[PDB]
């Protein structure tokens, strides 16, 4: 957070996490939910303000659905392939490409 603030990177960094254990949970259907979240609310974290200003008094909507951790995905899934259901004209893609 300190490095990104110094270099003026207007994005949250990737977070360290352990690779999620293999339970029943399917990741492909959750990659689809992440794609919908970015299409619908990706503008909430876009570099649109020339000022590094957040107006006090204005309420901020929760957008945890834009974080890969909310869909039980980590940095360890970035170079794994998933079914993306025709996104970008493709059947499969890596999470990094998504």
């Amino acid at each position: 957070d300190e490095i990104f603030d110094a270099m003026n990177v207007p994005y949250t960094p990737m977070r360290w996490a352990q690779d999620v254990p293999n339970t029943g949970v399917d990741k492909n259907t959750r990659v689809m939910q992440l794609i919908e979240a970015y299409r619908s609310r990706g503008h909430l974290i876009a570099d649109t303000n020339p000022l590094s200003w957040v107006q006090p008094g204005m309420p901020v909507p929760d957008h945890r659905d834009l974080d890969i951790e909310t869909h039980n995905l980590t940095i360890w899934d970035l170079d794994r392939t998933f079914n993306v259901g025709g996104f970008g004209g493709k059947e499969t893609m890596t999470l990094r490409e998504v």
């Binding site: 609310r41 909507p61 929760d62 957008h63 945890r64 659905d65």
Partner: protein, 49 residues
């Protein structure tokens, strides 16, 4: 399809996915997908009155 039809295509048409806050949008989603409860006979007579 039965769950989606009960929640969104019977006598109530809901518009809620444009809501930005994740907690508020999920509260509406979960209540609409729980369904409209089967009204009791007493409830039906109160509405008729």
């Amino acid at each position: 399809l039965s769950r989606l039809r009960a929640a969104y295509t019977l006598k109530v048409g809901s518009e809620y996915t444009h809501i930005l806050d994740r907690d508020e949008r999920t509260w509406l989603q979960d209540r609409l997908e729980a369904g409209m409860p089967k009204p009791t006979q007493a409830e039906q007579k109160y509405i008729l009155q």
